[PDB]
Amino acid sequence: HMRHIISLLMENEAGALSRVAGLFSARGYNIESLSVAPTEDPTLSRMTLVTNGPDEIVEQITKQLNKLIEVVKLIDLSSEGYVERELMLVKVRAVGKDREEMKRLADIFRGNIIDVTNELYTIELTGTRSKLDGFLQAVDCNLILEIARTGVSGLSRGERVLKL
Amino acid sequence: HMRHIISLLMENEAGALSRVAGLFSARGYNIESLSVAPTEDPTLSRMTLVTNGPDEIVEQITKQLNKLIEVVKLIDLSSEGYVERELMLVKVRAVGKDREEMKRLADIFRGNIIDVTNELYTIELTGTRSKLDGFLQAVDCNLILEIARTGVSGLSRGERVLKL
Ligand SMILES: [Ca+2]
Ligand SMILES: [Ca+2]
Numbered sequence: 191h192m193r194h195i196i197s198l199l200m201e202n203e204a205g206a207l208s209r210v211a212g213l214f215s216a217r218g219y220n221i222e223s224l225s226v227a228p229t230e231d232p233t234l235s236r237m238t239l240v241t242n243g244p245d246e247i248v249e250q251i252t253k254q255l256n257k258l259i260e261v262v263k264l265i266d267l268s269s270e271g272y273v274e275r276e277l278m279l280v281k282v283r284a285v286g287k288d289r290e291e292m293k294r295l296a297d298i299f300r301g302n303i304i305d306v307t308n309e310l311y312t313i314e315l316t317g318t319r320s321k322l323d324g325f326l327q328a329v330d331c332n333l334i335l336e337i338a339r340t341g342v343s344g345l346s347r348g349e350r351v352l353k354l
Numbered sequence: 355h356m357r358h359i360i361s362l363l364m365e366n367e368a369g370a371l372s373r374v375a376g377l378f379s380a381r382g383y384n385i386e387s388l389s390v391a392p393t394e395d396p397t398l399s400r401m402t403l404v405t406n407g408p409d410e411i412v413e414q415i416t417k418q419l420n421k422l423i424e425v426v427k428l429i430d431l432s433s434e435g436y437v438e439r440e441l442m443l444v445k446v447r448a449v450g451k452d453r454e455e456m457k458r459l460a461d462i463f464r465g466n467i468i469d470v471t472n473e474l475y476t477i478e479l480t481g482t483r484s485k486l487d488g489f490l491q492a493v494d495c496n497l498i499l500e501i502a503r504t505g506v507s508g509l510s511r512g513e514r515v516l517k518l
Contacts, residue, residue, distance in 0.1 A: 230498050236503070305512070316480050343442070
């Protein structure tokens with residue numbers, strides 16, 4: 191039951207994504223998080239999807255995904271060197287001494303405050319999964335007003351590219 | 355008309371995604387970018403989605419969308435003050451004088467190199483849509499080896515929050 195980061199190229203067209211999400215849904219496959227946006231080439235979008243399972247489940251999801259005509263290339267990004275980043279926006283209640291505390295946490299995690307009132311901050315964070323998770327462990331939950339978190343975006347290390 | 359950024363707070367069921375994605379697909383409308391990931395509410399995910407069509411029509415989907423039990427709340431983020439950021443990973447061919455040149459761009463856009471060889475950089479860039487777009491506008495496209503870009507993560511400004 192471990193994390194695989196699936197990376198795929200697909201037809202930037204209507205239904206493309208609803209069909210990819212439908213394939214998971216039909217069979218109750220987990221989607222932890224999902225990023226998709228156009229590439230260099232506007233006919234093709236790049237999707238980064240994170241799923242949680244034993245290998246034999248992932249290999250079957252991977253088998254089924256390749257079968258879709260709108261899925262063009264596909265790699266388990268996790269099976270080779272890669273880099274990943276996520277972006278997160280955390281809106282936090284920040285009054286009295288918690289104003290200093292929230293500012294210290296932002297600086298420690300190298301985030302930036304991008305919205306501010308007398309009683310709140312919106313903090314922008316970028317990093318690996320664990321950095322962003324470490325931020326959330328470190329903040330008191332009762333302070334969090336809401337969170338918007340982009341889901342992982344990754345690339346293979348070095349010369350390896352998905353389109354080739 | 356135009357560009358719309360829709361935030362939804364929903365169940366993390368696969369395709370609850372597909373079902374949301376479907377209602378844009380249903381009308382023949384392309385989802386340009388999309389992000390969905392866990393929130394503090396372990397059972398709930400936040401999804402931002404950027405799309406293109408006429409206000410009344412989006413408002414059609416809006417309604418259709420609200421009536422899904424899987425959807426807790428939604429707003430059209432543009433209808434009120436908001437902050438938005440995307441993240442992007444851009445792998446570039448960086449040989450000779452382009453090494454100095456590609457590093458300068460990174461610096462000017464305030465991005466970070468997170469993968470480097472003799473012949474390439476992968477640059478991480480975080481910002482508004484127009485900033486990332488402007489970075490892409492600045493690089494000769496024969497230098498871009500691949501891009502993985504997340505699409506928006508957005509929140510209302512100030513005390514406005516979606517779960518409320
Ligand atoms: Ca295929
Ligand atoms: Ca509802």
